Design an enzyme around this catalytic site. Structure first.
Site, mmCIF file in Angstrom:
data_model
loop_
_atom_site.group_PDB
_atom_site.id
_atom_site.type_symbol
_atom_site.label_atom_id
_atom_site.label_comp_id
_atom_site.label_asym_id
_atom_site.label_seq_id
_atom_site.Cartn_x
_atom_site.Cartn_y
_atom_site.Cartn_z
ATOM 1 N N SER A 18 -28.420 66.692 24.699
ATOM 2 C CA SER A 18 -27.383 67.593 24.194
ATOM 3 C C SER A 18 -26.718 67.034 22.935
ATOM 4 C CB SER A 18 -26.329 67.863 25.272
ATOM 5 O OG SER A 18 -25.410 66.789 25.375
ATOM 6 N N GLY A 19 -25.955 67.882 22.247
ATOM 7 C CA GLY A 19 -25.251 67.483 21.030
ATOM 8 C C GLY A 19 -24.441 68.603 20.403
ATOM 9 N N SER A 21 -24.055 71.761 19.119
ATOM 10 C CA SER A 21 -24.766 73.046 19.207
ATOM 11 C C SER A 21 -26.279 72.875 19.389
ATOM 12 C CB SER A 21 -24.451 73.939 17.997
ATOM 13 O OG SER A 21 -23.054 74.029 17.779
ATOM 14 N N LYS A 23 -29.519 71.263 22.037
ATOM 15 C CA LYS A 23 -29.967 70.857 23.365
ATOM 16 C C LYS A 23 -31.446 70.541 23.374
ATOM 17 N N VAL A 24 -31.872 69.613 24.215
ATOM 18 C CA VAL A 24 -33.288 69.291 24.415
ATOM 19 C C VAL A 24 -33.686 69.584 25.864
ATOM 20 C CG1 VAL A 24 -35.121 67.579 24.023
ATOM 21 C CG2 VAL A 24 -33.034 67.471 22.672
ATOM 22 N N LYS A 38 -36.393 71.440 21.479
ATOM 23 C CA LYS A 38 -35.052 71.213 20.955
ATOM 24 C C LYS A 38 -34.448 72.528 20.460
ATOM 25 C CE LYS A 38 -32.548 68.232 17.672
ATOM 26 N NZ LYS A 38 -32.676 67.036 16.795
ATOM 27 N N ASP A 131 -28.808 55.113 11.352
ATOM 28 C CA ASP A 131 -28.171 54.966 12.624
ATOM 29 C C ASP A 131 -29.248 54.547 13.548
ATOM 30 O OD1 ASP A 131 -26.482 56.697 15.048
ATOM 31 O OD2 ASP A 131 -25.417 56.003 13.331
HETATM 32 C C1 O22 Z 1 -32.403 63.285 23.597
HETATM 33 C C2 O22 Z 1 -33.859 63.146 23.882
HETATM 34 O O1 O22 Z 1 -34.510 63.885 22.902
HETATM 35 C C3 O22 Z 1 -35.831 63.969 23.057
HETATM 36 N N1 O22 Z 1 -36.312 63.443 24.170
HETATM 37 C C4 O22 Z 1 -37.599 63.476 24.443
HETATM 38 N N2 O22 Z 1 -38.084 62.953 25.565
HETATM 39 C C5 O22 Z 1 -37.378 62.480 26.585
HETATM 40 C C6 O22 Z 1 -36.073 62.125 26.450
HETATM 41 C C7 O22 Z 1 -35.377 61.643 27.525
HETATM 42 C C8 O22 Z 1 -36.000 61.495 28.729
HETATM 43 C C9 O22 Z 1 -35.248 60.981 29.897
HETATM 44 N N3 O22 Z 1 -34.574 59.875 29.816
HETATM 45 O O2 O22 Z 1 -35.255 61.601 30.919
HETATM 46 C C10 O22 Z 1 -37.309 61.851 28.863
HETATM 47 C C11 O22 Z 1 -37.995 62.333 27.789
HETATM 48 C C12 O22 Z 1 -38.499 64.035 23.588
HETATM 49 C C13 O22 Z 1 -38.124 64.602 22.415
HETATM 50 N N4 O22 Z 1 -39.036 65.129 21.613
HETATM 51 C C14 O22 Z 1 -36.719 64.610 22.071
HETATM 52 C C15 O22 Z 1 -36.327 65.136 20.970
HETATM 53 N N5 O22 Z 1 -35.983 65.614 19.988
#
Ligand code: O22
Length: 258
Positions: A18-19, A21, A23-24, A38, A131
């Protein structure tokens, strides 16, 4: 519970980020393949908008240049929303780092190589992520891949000045060397169990400490002598004295297997 991109339907397994506006979501397509979508709600200054446009274009361009950069299969952009279909991976480096007690020296070395190659790719194209943190890397196929380039607004998996370089603080009123310091903090944590100035709970103290040349960072002895050197070289306060990415790729720690 369902999303559509370029005439393709995906089922929302769960939200993973999230962020602002944005979301993933963890999704599946018709054949039950997994992807990461996303979502960005565009209802956002002319500038916030151009920042997402820039990120999308670079991410797409940079796809061909490195397999260490996250995969962008497709995306849908309108005046109302942005949908980005991309590689889903296993988990982000930041979440995985909290769950594991100790990390394997071989895994640490392999991961470091991946990070270096990813940051190297974006640097050759005039991008300095600004960052860099563990949350910016995704674990896919026992390998690390860069998620974003820090151009668009940052998101978080479902902030801290620990990885903040001293030059960025002194210049308060851009060099690729800044990414080196940040990478150094990540590898430092991967090696010692914490960031160089983690203990300072007082923020203005932490900031003063990151910039102060008299405040010496601890590098307690370890069996991998090269790793210790990498860390020392990466954590030089003066950016001109700090080791570069091309130099780090030729370092014994990365080059010579033990
Ligand atoms: C905030 C995480 O963002 C993403 N996570 C991704 N994978 C992910 C992220 C987090 C997890 C988790 N910790 O559950 C598992 C998978 C893939 C992405 N392409 C993006 C983007 N943009």
């Amino acid at each position: 519970e369902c999303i559509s991109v370029k005439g393709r339907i995906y089922s929302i397994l769960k939200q993973i980020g999230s962020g602002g506006s944005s979301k993933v979501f963890q999704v599946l397509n018709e054949k039950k393949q997994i992807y990461a979508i996303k979502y960005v709600n565009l209802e956002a200054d002319n500038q916030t908008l151009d920042s997402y446009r820039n990120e999308i274009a670079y991410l797409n361009k940079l796809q061909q240049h490195s397999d260490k950069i996250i995969r962008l299969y497709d995306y849908e952009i309108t005046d109302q929303y942005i949908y980005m279909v991309m590689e889903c991976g296993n988990i982000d480096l930041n979440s995985w780092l909290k769950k594991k007690k100790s990390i394997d020296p071989w895994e640490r070395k392999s991961y470091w190589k991946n990070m270096l190659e990813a940051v190297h790719t974006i640097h050759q194209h005039g991008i300095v992520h600004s960052d860099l943190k563990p949350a910016n890397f995704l674990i896919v196929d026992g390998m690390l891949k860069l998620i974003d380039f820090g151009i668009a607004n940052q998101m978080q998996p479902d902030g801290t000045v620990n990885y903040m370089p001293p030059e960025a603080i002194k210049d308060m009123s851009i060099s690729p060397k800044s990414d080196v310091w940040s990478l150094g903090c990540i590898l430092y944590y991967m090696t010692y169990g914490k960031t160089p100035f983690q203990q300072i709970i007082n923020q203005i103290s932490k900031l003063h400490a990151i910039i102060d040349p008299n405040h010496e960072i601890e590098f307690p002895d370890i069996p991998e002598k090269d790793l210790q050197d990498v860390l020392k070289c990466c954590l030089k306060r003066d950016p001109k004295q700090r080791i570069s990415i091309p130099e780090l790729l030729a370092h014994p720690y990365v080059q010579i297997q033990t």
